[PDB]
Structure 1
Amino acid sequence: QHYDESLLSRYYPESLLKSIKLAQQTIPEDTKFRVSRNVEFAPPYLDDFTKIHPFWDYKPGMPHLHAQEENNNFSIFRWDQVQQPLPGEGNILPPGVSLPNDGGRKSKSADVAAGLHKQTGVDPDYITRKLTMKPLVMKRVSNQTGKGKIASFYALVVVGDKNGMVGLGEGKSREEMSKAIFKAHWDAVRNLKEIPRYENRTIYGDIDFRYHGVKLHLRSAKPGFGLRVNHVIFEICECAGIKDLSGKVYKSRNDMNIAKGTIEAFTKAQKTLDEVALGRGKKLVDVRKVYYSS
């Protein structure tokens, strides 16, 4: 279509009007334009080509193959920055991806809390604020293969809220010990269990439990007695919320099997006074507690 100069002069710059007038006097109005299916000269979008894009066009003053300035008339005298920043927002962040602005502020506890919430439905706040994690065993194991010895990191950790809830987790990684601890921390939260506590300080009576080769002899203790037990048992009691306990380990003193044996003993070898009373149809009285009651 051929347009009158008035209309074209309200949209296009004066410098380009002469070209439009000459083109409207050389191309007849009845020209039947054909589409080329071999060479694509024009872009895939519509463009009048009246404005120079700061990114999609060559930078004015920059040297390049099609620069029209003379070699002594370039206007780029600073070379410390990228000449043509990305267009639009200034980034090409894929949809659904986040700029890694902060790194090292990520918390393995928070990474466990987010993943576990999505996978199991546990509350992230409880994991990141109420739980304490303590590594118990950290060693390197190896598998002999045809290629050669493949080393792996093994981590056994215990988590607990110091208020009855305790869990044991194991993790393996061929890359680094930190990844093994992350997996163990992840596993431990999934294995969280409640353990009965007498007066929320000790166990109900005495326990003689056999876990594989480990013989565990745990005795309840008076208030203010403290934890006088194997070091592995000490850490578990701290996370579980046991304050007073005595005991000895016989036969096998393997740390891994002591930790698992202890957790198993605290659940399978204890019976609350309430559970004993209901099963037997009898009243069980704590004489020490009654002595100081009204």
Structure 2
Amino acid sequence: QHYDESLLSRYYPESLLKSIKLAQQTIPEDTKFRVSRNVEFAPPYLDDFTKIHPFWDYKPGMPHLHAQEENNNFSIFRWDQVQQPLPGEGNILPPGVSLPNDGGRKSKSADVAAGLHKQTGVDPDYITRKLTMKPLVMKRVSNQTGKGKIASFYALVVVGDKNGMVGLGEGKSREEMSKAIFKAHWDAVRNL
């Protein structure tokens, strides 16, 4: 057929040469092959099927339908870790996304500073180190609508650097006082 003993041993393991030989001597040359359009059987990519690829072929020694090991041949005995992790880089981050980190989670002033730098170019270092935060009023505000009483969280906050700069901001949220004061702090920093 295409290649008989053409260095085929160097490219395929000896265990398969018998199968290739049998195929050469059973499928005739000039066979009028035709691609199938009703059903799909081969992968969209091209593979010689001579190596068991992790995460794309069943892990040996682990139970799975279409397995050929007996109940006394399984070689998996630990289940505290994810069998068959992801290939390549081992991660599936979309384009333009970052792994979550601390990100100043310990202080929402860091988030406020980053947002205000993004929006208007003020100094995150200054906002995070030289500004003092102080709520003044934190109360529940209600609206009566068709469905019923919709309660809202209202906060007002003063932010000041103790050296002349001062501002106040009001923030209204629907879910939590924390988001209310976050919005208020944002507005105050804007309105210094």
Moved more, 38-47 or 25-34: 25-34
Unaligned residue ranges in structure 1 (runs of 5+): 192-294
TM-aligned CA distance change 1:175 to 1:158, over 3 Å: same
TM-superposition CA deviations, 1:234-266 (whole Å, max 9, x none): xxxxxxxxxxxxxxxxxxxxxxxxxxxxxxxxx
TM-score, length of structure 1 as denominator length: 0.61
State how far apart, in whole Å, the 2-side matches of 1:38 and 1:65 are: 26
Within the alignment, does 1:82 sit opposite 2:57 as a pair?
Answer: no
Per-residue CA deviation, residues 78-134 of structure 1 (Å, 9 max, x unaligned), is 222222222222222222222234477352111111111111121211111121111
What displacement does 1:151 show? 1.0
Classify 1:130/1:101 alpha carbon distance in 2 versus 1 (closer, same or farther; 3 Å).
Answer: closer
Overall identity of the aligned pairs, in %: 100
Distance 2:160 2:99 in 1: 34
Cα distance in 1 for residues equivalent to 2:190 and 2:102: 28
SS class of match (1:137): strand
| Distance in 1 (alpha carbons) for counterparts of 2:102 and 2:168 | 31
Looking at structure 1, the residues matched to 106 and 19 of structure 2 have their Cα atoms a distance apart, in angstroms, of: 61
- Deviation per CA, 1:6-27, whole angstroms, max 9, x where unpaired? 4211111111111111111222
For the pair 1:156 / 2:156, whether they are aligned, the reply is yes
Mapped to 1, the partners of 2:117 and 2:58 lie a distance apart of 51
Q: Distance in 1 between matches of 2:103 and 2:122?
A: 25
Partners of 1:106 and 1:32 in 2: how far apart? 69
C-alpha deviations, 1:215-250, integer Å up to 9, x for none?
xxxxxxxxxxxxxxxxxxxxxxxxxxxxxxxxxxxx
**Higher CA-based Rg:** 1
- Cα distance in structure 1, aligned partners of 2:32 and 2:100: 54
Residue number in structure 2 paired with 1:181: 181
Contact kept in structure 1, 2:141 and 2:154, CA below 8 Å: yes
SS where residue 178 of structure 1 aligns?
helix
- Alignment partners' CA distance in 2, 1:118 and 1:150: 33
Quickly say closer, same or farther: Cα 1:113–1:103, change in 2 above 3 A: closer
User: Aligned to 2:46, what secondary structure does the other structure show?
Assistant: coil
Is the 2:54–2:84 contact (alpha carbons within 8 Å) kept by the matching residues of 1? yes
Partner of 2:117: 117
The 10-residue stretch of structure 1 (146-155 or 169-178) with the greater mean CA deviation from structure 2: 146-155
Separation in structure 1 between the aligned mates of residue 125 and residue 103 of structure 2, nearest angstrom? 21
Q: Distance in 2 between matches of 1:141 and 1:175?
A: 12
CA contact (8 A) 2:170 2:188 kept: yes
Kept after mapping to 1: 8 A contact 2:104/2:110: no
Structure 1 residues 104 and 121: CA distance shift in structure 2, 3 A: closer
Counterpart-to-counterpart distance in 1, 2:99 and 2:170: 33
Comparing 113-122 with 87-96, greater Cα deviation is found at 87-96
- Aligned 8 A contact 2:171 2:187 in 1: yes
**Cα separation, partners in 2 of 1:143 and 1:35, compared to 1, 3 Å:** same
Greater shift, 163-172 or 96-105, is seen at: 96-105
Alignment check: 8 A CA contact 2:112 2:186 kept? yes
Give, in whole Å, the separation in 1 of the partners of 2:59 and 2:165.
65
The alpha-carbon distance between structure 1 residues 103 and 119, as it changes in their structure 2 partners (threshold 3 A), is: closer
TM superposition outliers: structure 1 runs of 4+ over 6 Å: none
